[PDB]
Amino acid sequence: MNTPKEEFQDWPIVRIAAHLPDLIVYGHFSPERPFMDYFDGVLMFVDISGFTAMTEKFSSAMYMDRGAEQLVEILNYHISAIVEKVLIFGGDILKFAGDALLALWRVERKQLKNIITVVIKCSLEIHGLFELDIRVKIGLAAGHISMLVFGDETHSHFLVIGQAVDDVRLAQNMAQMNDVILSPNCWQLCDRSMIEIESVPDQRAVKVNFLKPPPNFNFDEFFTKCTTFMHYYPSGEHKNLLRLACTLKPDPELEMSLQKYVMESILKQIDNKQLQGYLSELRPVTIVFVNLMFEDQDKAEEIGPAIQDAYMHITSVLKIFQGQINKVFMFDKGCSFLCVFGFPGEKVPDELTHALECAMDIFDFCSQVHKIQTVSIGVASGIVFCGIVGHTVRHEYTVIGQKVNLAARMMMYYPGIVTCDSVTYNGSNLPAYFFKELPKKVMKGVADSGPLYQYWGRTE
Amino acid sequence: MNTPKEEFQDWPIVRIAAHLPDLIVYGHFSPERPFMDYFDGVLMFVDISGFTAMTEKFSSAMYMDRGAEQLVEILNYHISAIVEKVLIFGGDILKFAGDALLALWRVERKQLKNIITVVIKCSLEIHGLFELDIRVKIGLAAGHISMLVFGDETHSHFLVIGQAVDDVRLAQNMAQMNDVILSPNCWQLCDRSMIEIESVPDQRAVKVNFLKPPPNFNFDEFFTKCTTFMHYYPSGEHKNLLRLACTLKPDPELEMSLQKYVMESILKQIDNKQLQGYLSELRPVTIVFVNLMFEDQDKAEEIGPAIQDAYMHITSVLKIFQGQINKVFMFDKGCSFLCVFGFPGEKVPDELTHALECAMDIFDFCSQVHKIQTVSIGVASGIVFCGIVGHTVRHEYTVIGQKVNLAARMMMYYPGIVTCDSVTYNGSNLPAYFFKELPKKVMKGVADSGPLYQYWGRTE
């Protein structure tokens, strides 16, 4: 009797699971919204620099209208290699945002010290692959982490929250190219007998210099000990897989739960109802970047109800005005929603007007949600890259472009108002007195923004 | 000199062959129609219960318009596992019908006894995989089998015929969930020293209790002996394949012959001229289920010419009225054609009227074909699942739905007339006196049919 090969089965549930972390795939938590949970872990925030500028260059004539295809290929080639290292070192990729990603090693509190060594080693190997003018910067944090899941009956979103989350962002932002930086708490919890560091001027964070293993040390054996504490590390018969999620079996209840996190146009491609090619594009869109600031953004039980309330109105007005939520994350200050008008299927003239009216509506509503202290929204319009970024086994739809960065910076440097760029202002069919021309601010990461405006709105 | 890997070649002929049994793929018989051949074998009829009800539930809002995708995935996950067991035990899957399938072990007469043991073991392992409220029922028969091939210059269809065929259906219909039932002849021919059974009240068929191997028995060694008699069992260099048909090589004469069995829209997908996704759908259709009854339905030489004659008119009127033959099989009483109006590409309003006029035409013509004793047709309209069901190496296009079952039951419980359901009646643009409202019958497998009607037709 034969024992024939089992071909890998690439069921729709497995293709769905590529777009999600283990934290959600194996989370089995309540469908109630907001849902909050609490755990401990180590966070790694990896940023490739230089892709934002490459994006502008891939629009030029030299790429012969295959700029989107060439961009996603070279990006995925590099990002895939980082993803592989994260996964092989036992991490869970939570989200991709442009040319960056955020990874988590969730463990019980007593194992944080040893897992931090693992993550530092991972980071140093990652820094290694990049010895294309592209550099990698890495921020690490460790400690208490909260998770929020918010959404409605057909869509779900998650976020991680708390000091470790704020810390990992602060750390990555101080990093110079090729630095691995540790949060203050990460450095207080780490195995100091092995991690040689250098102080960072005016900061309590530190920079990793090198690993200094002791005499009998064997990283393989140590790693193996750490894998006792890693619930989903592929092992035994599945030690040849990058993710346990590759073995997920059809299960309609689980699939119903997981698909709510994934955009409809992505589900269409998963379902072989649309060609793979059409989601990689360089196309004119409007970014609407919404920031909600709270009194205490480390306190999920306070902020979760507010984010949910805001989300319920945001999703509804986006639907009216033809926009979509591409990504949500916690900033240094606030919960941000990266919203996009014009992407795969949704398109118009008056797209600009709609973006601005939608922004004002979100501003007016969210400003009155309990516990939201300040709302800020930046609106910018131009050619941006849209596509699936990452590795075959772990990837997400994301946007990359100078206008994405400009909207984010606008929302940060002009808090409490709705701002737009010049493309949006000039292009909109709105009268000029609905706007106010603003003082020009020098903005981290922005060469020349062009004139900027506040959308003051219809009256006053 | 290198000896590089040969990648599996997934030629169009191999993709075609997935839709057909070895009986046709390696049959090399005459292109004349009708063509009849005669052999012996063991039949297995496997029915999954519960999918029909799942179908109705996958239309509900909870599935978020991915009901067809979710249904076919969970169905294929389960059906694939049954297919694998059948193939590994040496069987040939003849056809899929909804959530059921029919498999054949063709052997010389002296080997029936030993092959029945093989098939019983297979069935018990199948019953095993299912220890989703889904149960499996299995009917087994053995003896003389006839095959009919009928068709025209561009389409071919096959059927198996005779007492063993009637028996395998009777056996499966007495089975309670999880039973394996043997036909009377199967039980008379089997190795009684090993097969422990229980009598079935008012029946000569029996139910399998267990296998009772004797002292020196080794199933592997026994199976190996049986494989001497199995012409296409994958072996040697190809022992890692589920089917020898996976090695089929391009051959335009053979492909021309085999494609005649496969629907045009399936050939389009095989040819990479249409996306895979679009054939899985939950869509409103009309089923027209035609039953032809004969004086002796076990006698191919009598019934073959009649089926061919009926087929020639059916295919032509279906073409006029935009219908298609989805499946043909022998019932307990008769040769049935499962015909569908509205599926992938063919669609209209007046679809209902056309279904009814086509049905009446088929009824009038077939009632006058020599040797057809009675024609019965059931017409029902609703949402039905349409898609490719089975395993990657062996699968077919089929339909599943409560309206498929209702049409089949109508045709059986109201013989000699054309009947329709209420959806079809109310929806048709035909005057009401073309119909007659019928007494309601309690019908095996039908909760509440709604009012039913006879299509009496234009005059009388």
Added chain:
Amino acid sequence: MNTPKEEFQDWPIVRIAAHLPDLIVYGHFSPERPFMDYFDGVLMFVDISGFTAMTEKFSSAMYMDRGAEQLVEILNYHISAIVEKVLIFGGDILKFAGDALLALWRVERKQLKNIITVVIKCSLEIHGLFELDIRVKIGLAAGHISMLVFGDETHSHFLVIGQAVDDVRLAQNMAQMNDVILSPNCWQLCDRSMIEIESVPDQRAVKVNFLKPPPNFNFDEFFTKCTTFMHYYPSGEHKNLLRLACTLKPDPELEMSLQKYVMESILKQIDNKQLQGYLSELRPVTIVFVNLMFEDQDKAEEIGPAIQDAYMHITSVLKIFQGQINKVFMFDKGCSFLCVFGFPGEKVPDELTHALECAMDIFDFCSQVHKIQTVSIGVASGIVFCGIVGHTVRHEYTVIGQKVNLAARMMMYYPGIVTCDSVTYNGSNLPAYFFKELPKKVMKGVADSGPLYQYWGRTE
């Protein structure tokens, strides 16, 4: 720590590289046009006979509108096997033209003798696979070879040039079915102690009879020695691949260079923006076969500037009149461009008129380019097969059909004018006095051409 499988990555650059030889993929030469380089090598020209006639037959009703699909499958099955042998013996496939291909073993001059033995062995094994009424004929040449690359800022084309190139064509044209013929120079350079031959009446070329290895000879060991001189032979960790090009890594500069050789509609399919199926078709087109003759067609430095100049005008007028360059090669006499009107996306009525006006324009312009001695153009219209031919790892878009051959023969047998077939003449919307009915010539490879015409043009 796991070491998971790396799945083959089928990046867009690798899919591009399938359409090109190693000569271009790893050539890294100047973007200047014309670019010429010089080397030595052995050429093999392999022709399958019989596919041209199969093409006409795959249009017949028996193929049930899947003639293109069936044709490309059976062709690729056979051609793939020839490709594999060429690659495993260390050759580089330069181009496919219909059911023929041309392969190169580039080596330093001192190694020509031993490499010729390798190529003869390859050819004898190829002749072996074909012991479908299809025969294979092989011509071999060896010596100095020039390469020309010509083109503009977005398209590139290459050619090989010189006596060895002329010789390999002459040799293949004398071959009877199943012959392997050596050019005079090939026979003068080969290892005569091992290659037994037969003279060819009125020719200095010879025919291979057999290999006569000496006593201690071991082909494997000898082959291994020869692989020292083969720059890209897959080896070590990559000894299981048919081409090193299968390992190519994303590199936007390299991809920008390589894509210029590949048709836009092919790049669309590579990019998963169009279904694979649609490029295999049997469709009515017009072939415009342009031949440029030079005083000395073995002298790249003379002819390269002329071909470039001609190309610059040809590409521009083709664009106006909706045609495309499908292939370019050196004939016995001249550089020929195989141009096609009507293929995937480009289509009209007046297609015929346009083909003829485009032809006349090319004729008038190219006749005045310095060093072009004579221009000849044949225009023929009918159903031709268009599709990707070859192996998964090495294939190209090409056309096959009796009308392709007829246009080529017209251009050769009626030099110095523009000729057309009867389909083109009758179909064109041009007045009859724009033409001249020509004497009928018996033409190598042409049963009955129908009446032929000179397109005399508007005036005289």
